[PDB]
Amino acid sequence: MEHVAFGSEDIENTLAKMDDGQLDGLAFGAIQLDGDGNILQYNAAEGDITGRDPKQVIGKNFFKDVAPCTDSPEFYGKFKEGVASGNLNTMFEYTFDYQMTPTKVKVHMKKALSGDSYWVFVKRV
């Protein structure tokens, strides 16, 4: 298993070297998004938390298609204030309830090193 702590400050660096293989190795959910919110990567652990199948969720819109319950000011709005600003780094608690048992999680979103793309890291709470 891969040694990185959630909320780690330099985390967007650490993961800069991970492939889809090394990503499934973490202790917590990891989604890589573009600016439109289409999903570029999606780890085993977020599959574990949400019951979604990592491999099929790739290419879908996170906020249109995969998780409509994050299409609020308090999540999607955040995300998109970040994308136009060019910078994003926020952590917050949040309840995933879409087509699933309501699950309280903590969320950290953050801009990745790579061009136009963003992470969301998720862990139970």
Total of domains in the chain? 1
Dihedral (Cα; 110, 50, 62, 3), 10-degree rounding:
30
Residues in the chain, overall count: 125
Listed resolution, Å: 1.6
CA 17 to chain centre: 17
Beta-strand runs (E) in 1-125: 29-33, 39-42, 89-96, 103-111, 118-124
Q: Write out the residue range of the structural domain in which residue 84 sits.
A: 1-125
Please, which experimental method was used?
X-ray
Domain CATH for 108: 3.30.450.20
DSSP secondary structure string, 1-14? -----TT-TTHHHH
Structure tokens at 107: 């969320």
